[PDB]
Design a protein around this ligand. Structure first.
Ligand SMILES: [Ca+2]
Ligand SMILES: [Ca+2]
Lengths: 247, 247
């Protein structure tokens, strides 16, 4: 299987290296990731200026390239220029920290995998749900096992898998829905040497989902959270109501 | 989009001119076709003798060249010496007459596109389903409209689309599978002036497909037939059984 590995922390990140090396023992792995920190870049793409790539070494077992673009740019470039449109699976990660709730909208890790979903290529965004003490190997090992037990034909079109792995013990797998986890974010105001004020974004997490099958609850219980998501944001319930009211 | 256009009827065929002209209205078109009739040449290529090319005129925006080779040779030449290995799409046609069932194996039109598939370049073979009232403009116009509605990421690697446009009115299009339409060939015997007999190949068509989603049935109904085909001929079903018995 020809696998494309990418991430949003940079090609030199420990999370992507372990993932690539472990996947290289059984598959043909191609790594195309950002040449710098791309966390919180969401699904941004580069259209105003050109993109550049650089061949880098990360293992004699894998073909690697860094690009001046975003995670989504990396997937487009890998697909069209590095892998000759021959990609069997796309894995974006392993990210240091969780990617759950509404945070996935600005997640670079998720965007990489989503670009794959948009092309109907089986894709997975994988994150170690513990920023402080991440377990890249455990997440990678879990993935290798998942690839042997999961049947990707069950994946509907334009659908990818957003995966969050507990850092401690993995007590099992659980298919979940995206939660509404978000933040009470504010700003820390400060003053620069030249007398101009500046702001630092800060925040406290909000976990107020009443539903029992959401992503963070599963992870909280030591269970890997596997959420099938697609690039469609329509609020059907609301749409139906707006119509039965006007038109 | 850098598009390569070829055929099996010769660069002077009305079928290829109409097609190249329309595609140029919004695409960088290059035409590399045979300098002579090449219908029924299948996937033959020129390896025993040299290949020659000749600059030809068709449009002020379209770069054209005829060659002494087959449709397949044309694609190899076009790609390596005319388009600097930069081809986004290959379209072969528009052919005068259908290309469905087993007949696609000896079709020069199909082979032009199949060579592109072998080189892993998105390719399309397009034919007007009526030999006697062909409709080159209709077939070409359908393709232009189809391109605006087709997602090339869904066209697997080494795969091409074999398209047959019915003559007359198009009710719509369908993604079909290759049928087993074929011919019961035979020969009419005749004698030359010098007393030696010769044979003229003739034949009656055989249409005995029980499946409803095959190419010719869609065409008969007034629908464009679109079949995704590739250069892989293994009979998996037969192979499976052979391995079960000779394990
Ligand atoms: Ca990150
Ligand atoms: Ca022909």
């Amino acid at each position: 299987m020809r696998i494309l590995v990418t991430n949003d922390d940079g090609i030199q990140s420990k999370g992507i290296i372990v993932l690539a090396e472990l996947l290289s023992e059984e598959h043909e792995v191609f790594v195309v990731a950002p040449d710098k920190e791309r966390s919180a870049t969401g699904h941004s793409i580069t259209i105003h200026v050109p993109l550049w790539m650089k061949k880098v070494f990360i293992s004699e077992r894998v073909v690697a390239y860094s690009t001046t673009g975003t995670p989504a740019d990396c997937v487009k470039l890998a697909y069209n220029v590095v892998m000759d449109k021959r990609v069997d699976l796309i894995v974006s990660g392993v990210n240091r920290g969780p990617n759950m709730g509404m945070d996935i909208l600005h997640s670079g890790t998720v965007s990489g995998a989503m670009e794959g979903a948009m092309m109907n290529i089986p894709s997975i965004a994988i994150s170690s749900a513990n920023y402080e003490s991440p377990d890249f190997e455990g997440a990678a090992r879990f993935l290798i096992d998942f690839l042997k037990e999961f049947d990707f034909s069950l994946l509907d079109p334009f659908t990818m898998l957003n995966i969050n792995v507990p850092a401690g013990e993995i007590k099992g797998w659980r298919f979940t829905r995206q939660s509404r986890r978000r933040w009470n974010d504010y700003f820390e105001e400060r003053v620069s040497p030249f007398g101009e004020k500046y702001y630092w974004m800060m925040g406290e997490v909000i976990e107020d989902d009443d539903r029992d099958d959401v992503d963070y609850k599963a992870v909280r219980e030591g269970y890997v959270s596997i959420t099938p998501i697609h690039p469609f944001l329509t609020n059907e319930q609301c749409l139906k109501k707006l119509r039965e009211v006007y038109d």
